[PDB]
A paper describes a structure:
Herein, we characterize the 2-hydroxy-1-naphthaldehyde (HNA) fragment as a targeted covalent reversible ligand of a noncatalytic lysine (Lys720) of the Krev interaction trapped 1 (KRIT1) protein. The PPI between HEG1 and KRIT1 is believed to play an important role in controlling vascular development and permeability under normal and pathological conditions. The HEG1 binding domain of KRIT1 features three lysines, namely Lys475, Lys720, and Lys724; based on point mutation studies, these residues are essential for the interaction between HEG1 and KRIT1.14 The HNA was found to form a reversible imine adduct with Lys720, and SAR studies indicated that the HNA is the smallest/simplest 2-hydroxy-arylaldehyde that inhibits the HEG1-KRIT1 PPI. However, the interaction of HNA within the HEG1 binding pocket of KRIT1 induces proximity of the aldehyde moiety with the ε-amino group of Lys720, resulting in the specific targeting of this amino acid residue.
To evaluate the potential of the HNA as a site-directing fragment to identify HEG1-KRIT1 PPI inhibitors with potentially improved binding affinity and inhibition activity, we synthesized and screened a series of HNA derivatives bearing substitutions at the C6 or C7 position of the naphthalene ring. The C6 and C7 positions were selected for substitutions as an analysis of the available HNA-KRIT1 co-crystal structure indicated that these two positions may provide opportunities for analogs with improved complementarity to the HEG1 binding region of KRIT1. The co-crystal structures of 3, 5, and 6 in complex with KRIT1 revealed that these compounds exhibit similar binding modes as the parent HNA fragment, including the presence of the imine adduct between the aldehyde moiety of the HNA derivative and the ε-amino group of Lys720. However, compared to the unsubstituted HNA, derivatives 3, 5, and 6 established additional interactions with KRIT1. Additionally, both furan derivatives 5 and 6 were involved in hydrogen−π interactions with KRIT1 Gln473. Interestingly, the binding positions in the three crystal structures appeared nearly identical with the HNA binding pose generated in the MD simulations. Thus, the X-ray and activity data indicate that the binding affinity of the HNA for KRIT1, and the consequent inhibition activity of this fragment in the HEG1–KRIT1 PPI assay, respond to elements of SARs, and in turn highlight the importance of structure complementarity and templating effects in promoting the formation of specific and relatively stable imine adducts with KRIT1 Lys720.
Numbering used by the authors:
A (entry chain B): 1 to 62, 67 to 167
B (entry chain A): 419 to 647, 652 to 730
Amino acid sequence: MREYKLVVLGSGGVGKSALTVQFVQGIFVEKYDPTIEDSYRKQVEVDAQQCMLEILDTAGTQMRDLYMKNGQGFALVYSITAQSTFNDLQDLREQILRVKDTDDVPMILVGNKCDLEDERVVGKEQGQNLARQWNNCAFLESSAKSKINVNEIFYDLVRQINR
Amino acid sequence: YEKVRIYRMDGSYRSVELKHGNNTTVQQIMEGMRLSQETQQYFTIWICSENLSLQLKPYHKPLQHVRDWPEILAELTNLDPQRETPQLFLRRDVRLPLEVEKQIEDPLAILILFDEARYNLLKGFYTAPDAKLITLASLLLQIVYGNYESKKHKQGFLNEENLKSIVPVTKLKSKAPHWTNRILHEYKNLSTSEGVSKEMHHLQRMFLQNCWEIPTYGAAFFTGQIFTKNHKVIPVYVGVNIKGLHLLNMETKALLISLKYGCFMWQLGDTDTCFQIHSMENKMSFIVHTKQAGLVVKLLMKLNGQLM
Ligand SMILES: Nc1nc2c(ncn2[C@@H]2O[C@H](COP(=O)(O)OP(=O)(O)NP(=O)(O)O)[C@@H](O)[C@H]2O)c(=O)[nH]1
Ligand SMILES: *Cc1c(O)ccc2cc(-c3ccco3)ccc12
Ligand SMILES: [Mg+2]
C-alpha cells in the first residue's frame, strides 16, 4: 500500500479542518477551534489502487517550510465568503514552488463553504481564473457541511502524485 | 508556547497547547482536545512506549512521566530504556463500564473506540472463535473498502496484503487463507442487505457490538511470567478489564485462562514482585511474577468494586 503525504494549507477559518474531518471521519465540525497541527490517516481506493493517505491539517497562521519539503500534494483552501483568504493563497502557491524548486507540484485550489451561496464574496469564475494562471491547476468548489466536493479534493491529489 | 502531540492507535495525532508547560495535567490536556463533555467521558490520556502502556489520571502531569520514563521502566519492567521512547495517546478508559459503552451514540466516540478495537484485533489481543473473527473481517471490508462488487472482490482480492488489515496477525498465516470464501460471503451479505445501515458510525458500532463479547475487550495489558509444573518460564500478557482477568501467551497470544469477577481471587506478593490467583471450582492456583503486580492488583480491586 503506497503512502501519500497530503498537506491542507490556507488562512484561518476557511474550513481546512472541517474538510479533512468530513473526509476522514464523516463528521461536520461546527465549533471553531483554531488548529495547532493535526495529522490524519485514511485508506482509500484511487484508480483500483489501495492508498494510505496521511493528511496534515495545518494552522491558519503557521514550521511551514517543513510541511512543503515533506508534503507530496497540497490542497490550497479559501472561503468563498472571505476575500482576504483568497488573496493569501498566491503567496502559498509561490512559496511551495520555491521549496520544491519546480512548478510540477501536485496541487489543488479549493474554494470552500460553497453552501453559503448567499454570503459569497468570491465568485466561481474568479476562482477558476486563478487556477488558470497557476499552470492550469486543479480547481474545486467544495462544502464540508454539505459533503460537496470533499472526497475528490484528496482523490485528485493522489492522481496528480501518481502521474 | 508549549505543545504536545496526542496520538491515537491509527497513527493520527492532535497537537494540544500546554498552558502550564510540563506542569500541565491530563485534565487540562483533555480540555485542549476537540471533545465535548459527551465524547470526553469515555477516554483519557495514556502514556505508552513499545512495551509498556500506562493509563494516567486527571491530576497526573504526562510530560513529567515522559521525563521520568527510564525510572518508570526500571520500576515496573526489566526492559532497557534506550529502545523505549514514550508517546501520549488518547485511549478508552479502562474503567469505562461496558453498560455505559453500549449506550454511546456519538459518532466521534464510536470511531475512536472502533479504531482502538481494530488495533487490538489485528495485533491478536482479541481471542475469539473463527466465526466471530470472520464476521469482524467482513465488517472491516465494508467499512474500509465500501460496498462489495463481484468484479472487484470475488477472486484474488483477499491476498495476504489485504488479509492483514482485516484479520489478526496471529491468524494471518495458517488459518486466515482458509477463511476467504466465508469472509467474502458475509461481506457480500452486508452490502446487498438494505436492512443494515451503511452509515459509517452505524457500521463501526456493529464492529464494536461483536467485540463487546470478547473476554479481553477493553483490557489493560501488563507483562509478567509464570512457571510450569520441571519448571519452564512462560512469558504472559496479563489482561485486566471490567469483566475480569485473562492470561495470554506472550509469543502466540493464545488465551491461557479467562476469569470473571466473582469466580477468582487475588493476593499481592510480599515483595510486590508477584501476585497469586485462586480460581473457584477450578480448584487451581497460579502465581504471576511481574514488577507491575502492584498495579495489577490495584486495578483488579477497583474494577471488581465497580461491579454491583
Ligand atoms: N456553512 C459552512 N461552514 C463551514 C464550512 N466549512 C467550515 N465551516 C465552519 O467554519 C468554521 C471554521 O472551520 P475550520 O475547519 O475550523 O477552519 P480552519 O481552516 O481549520 N481554521 P484554522 O486555520 O484556525 O485551524 C467552523 O465554524 C466550521 O463549522 C462549510 O462548508 N460551510
Ligand atoms: C489506581 C487506578 C484507578 O483508581 C483507576 C484506574 C487505574 C488504571 C490503571 C492502569 C490502566 C492501564 C495500566 O494501568 C492503574 C491504576 C488505576
Ligand atoms: Mg483547523
